[PDB]
Nucleic acid binder design. Sequence first.
DNA 1: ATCAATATCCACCTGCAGATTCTACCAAAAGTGTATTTGGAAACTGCTCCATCAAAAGGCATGTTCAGCTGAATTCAGCTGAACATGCCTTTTGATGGAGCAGTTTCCAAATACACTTTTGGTAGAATCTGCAGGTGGATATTGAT
DNA 2: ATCAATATCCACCTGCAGATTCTACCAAAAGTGTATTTGGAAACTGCTCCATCAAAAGGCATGTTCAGCTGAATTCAGCTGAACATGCCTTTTGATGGAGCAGTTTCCAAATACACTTTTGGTAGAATCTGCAGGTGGATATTGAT
Lengths: 99, 96, 84, 77, 93, 92, 106, 102
Amino acid sequence: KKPHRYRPGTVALREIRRYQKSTELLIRKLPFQRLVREIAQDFKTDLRFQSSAVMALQEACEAYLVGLFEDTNLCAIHAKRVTIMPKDIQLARRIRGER
Amino acid sequence: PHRYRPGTVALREIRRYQKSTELLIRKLPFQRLVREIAQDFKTDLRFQSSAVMALQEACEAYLVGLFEDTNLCAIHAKRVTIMPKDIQLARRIRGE
Amino acid sequence: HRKVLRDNIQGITKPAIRRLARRGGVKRISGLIYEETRGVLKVFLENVIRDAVTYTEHAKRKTVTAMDVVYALKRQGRTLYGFG
Amino acid sequence: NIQGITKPAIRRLARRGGVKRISGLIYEETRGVLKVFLENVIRDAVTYTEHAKRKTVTAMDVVYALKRQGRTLYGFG
Amino acid sequence: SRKESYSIYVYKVLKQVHPDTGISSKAMGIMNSFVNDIFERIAGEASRLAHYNKRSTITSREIQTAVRLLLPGELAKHAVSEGTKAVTKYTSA
Amino acid sequence: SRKESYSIYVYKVLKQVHPDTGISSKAMGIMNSFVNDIFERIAGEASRLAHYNKRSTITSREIQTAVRLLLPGELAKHAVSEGTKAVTKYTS
Amino acid sequence: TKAVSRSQRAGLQFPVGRIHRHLKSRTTRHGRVGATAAVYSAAILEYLTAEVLELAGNASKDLKVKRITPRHLQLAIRGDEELDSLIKATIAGGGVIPHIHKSLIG
Amino acid sequence: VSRSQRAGLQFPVGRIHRHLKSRTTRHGRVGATAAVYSAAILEYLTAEVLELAGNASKDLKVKRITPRHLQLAIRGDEELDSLIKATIAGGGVIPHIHKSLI
DNA sequence: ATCAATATCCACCTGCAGATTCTACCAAAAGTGTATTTGGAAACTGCTCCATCAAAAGGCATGTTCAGCTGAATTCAGCTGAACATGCCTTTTGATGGAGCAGTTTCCAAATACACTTTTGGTAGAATCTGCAGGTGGATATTGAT
DNA sequence: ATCAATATCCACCTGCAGATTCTACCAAAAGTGTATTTGGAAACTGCTCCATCAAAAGGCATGTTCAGCTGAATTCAGCTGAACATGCCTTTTGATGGAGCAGTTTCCAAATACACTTTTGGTAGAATCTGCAGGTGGATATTGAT
Ligand SMILES: [Mn+2]
Ligand SMILES: [Mn+2]
Ligand SMILES: [Mn+2]
Ligand SMILES: [Mn+2]
Ligand SMILES: [Mn+2]
Ligand SMILES: [Mn+2]
Ligand SMILES: [Mn+2]
Ligand SMILES: [Mn+2]
Ligand SMILES: [Mn+2]
């Protein structure tokens, strides 16, 4: 009686279906908030945030990163791979005009 | 009889046209294309000459930049030969 | 007054990055992606927050508003809907 | 008419862009891309032209159209 | 602390096109951002058109040209038709 | 009314930084486009800044914030410094 | 003679007088705003709103719900070529349209 | 004494003040020093660009700055490169061949 | 090319959090009367852009030859996915001060307004002097033969 | 890995066309002097909502084992795209007339602005309404070891 095991890639594809169906934010909220406050405080001590300001920052950061993983994936496929790698991210950012 | 090996003259051309700034599309056929396209929008259009030149500077700059991004995509795939799929990838990432 | 914040870029965990990549359609992920993604995110966030705080400081406020963020995102060509 | 944009001109633009080897299918793909770009720019340029109740497209019409497509051009006013 | 918004007008249009449909408040916030965004684009381009042509009045003609610059393809034809219909109706009294 | 250009001022700056150096007509066209471009970016952002804060005056505080939003870093700090110097020389 | 709404007069739902005031206060130094400029603007905004709500409501109806969410706005805008190129902004809470590249399915 | 001269500037404070006054909203005003600050920014960036391009022109031993020298100056300076994305007509590109193409 | 595992899909249901409707004040839209601005018709003229005509050379089109790039086929070390035990830290909801964002009032430093004199800057022709066309001759770099 | 041949590239040259710089006129516009108004700062205060902490539990992150299958490395030949000779045509260049229009200035009926007043459409908050978010269960499709 061997325990059931999905083959590598089956669960990844199910996870794609799942997260592409839904819309909830995918970074944990309190750690994202700590990050925002850390960076902001390094620009200006003793700042406060409206909670909606933090949420707007998280929405924009997650949309940006999802869009970047889409482009990165296009580059990895272009090289006949299914695995994204740093060089894919860097090519996509270069063609996007980012630094 | 002297023969350069494939790629020697291409490299030389790269250095040549990256050293220079002149327009690379010939004037009259570009002007003809501009007028034909504009026909599909308003008739008896006249053009200032500086307007056609503006459009050519923009078109050539656009194509040059596109070919730099296309070259990046060919190189990413371990090729030196740009192919239509390289143009298509660069334009899709560019949002075009 | 609160505990000093340090090293919170690590709060963006490997599973969080994997979920983001999955929403982006990615099936397989190099082990080196996670740190690369952290670096890219930090730059993005820094740049947005820099401008948001510039708006906050121009308004003589101590509180970053959602509008400061919206304006910063617009100034960067990343317009955001839903927070006006 | 788009065929007056010749294979050697296209090759010259690619060379300025740093390209060493060019697939045979590139020339027609490039004509397609060029045609779309020129259409979009000229459509806006002419829109500016007919707003001014003019019959002659100015360099300023072209500059404004390039500006509003995010491809600002310096040098023509 | 009175705050104007497009919410009731968006809602009236919604009841026109989908009589049995509502809208969450987050979606309504999205529609409000959309309306304010398009309005700023049209107003700015309209001001620039007026300036280019040495006119000091923004008229329906600057608005129409702004719409034709702003809107792709079919959306432009449909929007221009809605706008000229609204103007001709308005001036007919 | 007049067909304005920045050419004479650009030329005066050229003679300040490189006394022996000329400039072609086409390059001067590029410099005029550049000056008008930057000016409209700064005036636009300064205008918006005033409005966001329910004010109708564009002051040098708006110009300075716009410069900090529009210019990338070292250029921004040097530009601010130059604006500040000019304002205090002017009001002296 | 009782008051007549400029909106009703234009046959519109969007508010012509309010939009006219927005145009008057966002202009030039001595700028003027013609009477029908606000009519035209309101009609454009109203039409664009109608198109977005039409598609979004079709998507919500297909998923058997009664309320439009950002999810439906996103599906509607990104699923329509012209709306997609008009509206480049991020739709908060919108997610993405399903798509798995062919080479990734075994 | 002109406002430009008072500020120690070459760029025209009064003209710029009129232009700013033209980009206000209804009832918009322009403060006493905003044109001075604006003119100073414009002169500063103009001087940075011309200084670099003039360096290029002298290095090529010609006496006049051309679009080409402006392009080399701007594209070779990371800050100016990021500030100025517009097409420099007649500037060409900076020479560069990717390593694998040699 | 059969069967257990397990995920996914697809009905159902309620009550409560979120959305919609109700309610009544009131800010701003609309009406009135009057004052000021303007855009668009109307003559008016030079500039500039189009059409047409021509020679000719410079670059494109085409056909051959073959170097060497791309893509296909193969192999395999080890990276990354799947699964899961462990336990912690995020989420959720509320308390509690109080920082600081908004709302009001005043009243002045800062801004506009206007008449008038000085001063500037766009223009077009003269005067000046750069940089381009081609030419050389040397530097450099490629190619074949070893 | 020299070492001859051989092709191209790159400073450098002169002569001078012509592109830039110089010059001077003159509407336009900047600056000044004076007067006057006013946006917004400086207090002052209501009172929102923000920071931080608390608790508890359970969703989820972490770290590990193990092996499937991916990326990496390698080989190679079919075929495509580079190089080149050659011959032809399209573009360039140079000129010449004039039609068309864009740019200019005047004029004023139509259009828009503005203060004051009337009226109500639009808003905040309260009351009311009800989707749909999670539950639940069971059928269907997929998967992967046989
Ligand atoms: Mn810190
Ligand atoms: Mn002078
Ligand atoms: Mn030469
Ligand atoms: Mn000789
Ligand atoms: Mn008074
Ligand atoms: Mn006041
Ligand atoms: Mn062979
Ligand atoms: Mn009522
Ligand atoms: Mn459910």
